[model samples]
Target: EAIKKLVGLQAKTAVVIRDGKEIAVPVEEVAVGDIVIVRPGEKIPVDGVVVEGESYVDESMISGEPVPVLKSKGDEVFGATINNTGVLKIRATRVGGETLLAQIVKLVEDAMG
Candidate 1:
């Protein structure tokens, strides 16, 4: 049987900043308050507020718009959205199963049942 993948699904790991160093950790292990770093071509790891940097993101998975949306400091970004053209620093307000992607998946699963 063929399975379809959701374009807005979260990745396995996320790059985070801790104690002034950048590192990668499992998405489940990414804690609230952690600084998530998403670079161009990478997916945003969790739902959070943008603390630094600016970029265009392909939020088509959520918004259904073909054009990338601009994001910068003070903007709210959701997990699993693809970063398009620059690096973004996000403060993880929600992680793991609490993220927006997880809720969307939940909605679809419940509807299927």
Candidate 2:
């Protein structure tokens, strides 16, 4: 179950905008400063600040809060959080193993081992 949850925290791919187009990119390939777009029913790929659009994000998995939280321009979002409604464009501030989700994974792994 621990491993399952750990694996669930990973976003295998992320949608990023480049050259005025949105494309799917490997999560590992995401870098800080990349503009990532997330739609309803999708997960936030990296810890970042919302730059465009607005949404209600489900961060219950990470925060233990049952209600979805509103996110918009200048709001901070974490990787692995789900976008509940609306589309959001976020500027990646932390990616790969540097994300807060990754840190939590590392902590869980170390504790379990």
Candidate 3:
């Protein structure tokens, strides 16, 4: 329920295409199949497919490696990974409870039992 508080807000918002209109929105508003704009130094808010632009993402949180990974069109980007050196417009494939962070939350919850 931690994320439940930060709902509808983000330290920095990314541009999103909602019905073909480009607008900036919070992380929580990111929904599956929506295209999101991620820039350098922002954490990706959802697991998505790169639809446009290119970038290097620091996915150490997921990869456990310090080296940045290159992302281009058709590449997969997971939620919560930090963007390193480029702008990316990714199409959200998974959001909310389907994200990696939520998976970790499930693990932590189960481990406590």
Candidate 4:
């Protein structure tokens, strides 16, 4: 259902197959089956599935919660969140201009300006 909304809305997306899979494609080049990896201490590059690994993530950037949360395989991770511990493999469920992090950044920037 959620994927249906995304596809219907023409949302930008990517796919993570498994852990340690690196995708070198540009944001605009991402498709439905491209795997993206996020390492420990790295900011989440795109919103997508945690196809493998685990981590303690700081989601305060999006959720406004200062505390870090443990995210494991199959967890839906969002973009812009800082990884506090462990590594992650994200499927890139949303990418490019339609990413949640991109939208949030735009929103904040617009509001500030």
Q: Tens digits of per-residue lDDT for model 1 on 1-113?
A: 10135533668899999999998888878999999999999999889999999999998777678999999999999887899999999999988767877777777778987
Return the TM-score for each candidate structure. 0.88, 0.91, 0.80, 0.66
Q: Which stretches of candidate 1 lie over 4 Å from their true place?
A: 1-4
TM accuracy, model 3: 0.80
Residue 97 lDDT (model 4):
62
Give a tens-digit lDDT track for model 4, residues 27-80: 467654567766677767677888888899988756768899989888987766
Worst 10 residues of 2 by lDDT: 1-10
- Model 1 weakest 10-residue run by lDDT: 1-10
Estimate, for each residue in 1-113, the C-alpha lDDT of model 3 and write its tens digit: 34443332222455788877888886677778888887888888788899888889987766678999999999999877888888899988888778766676667668976
Residue pairs clashing, model 3: none
**Which tens-of-lDDT digit does each residue in 1-113 have in candidate 2?**
54468568778899999899988989988889999999899999899999999999999888889999999899999998999999999999999888888888888889988
User: Can you give the lDDT of residue 65 in candidate 2?
Assistant: 95
- Give the clashing residue pairs of candidate 2, or none: none
By descending lDDT, how would the candidates be arranged?
2, 1, 3, 4
Candidate 3 Cα misplacement greater than 4 A, ranges: 1-13
Tell me which of candidates 2 and 3 scores higher on TM-score: 2
Q: What is the lDDT of residue 113 in candidate 1?
A: 75
- Rank list by TM-score: 2, 1, 3, 4
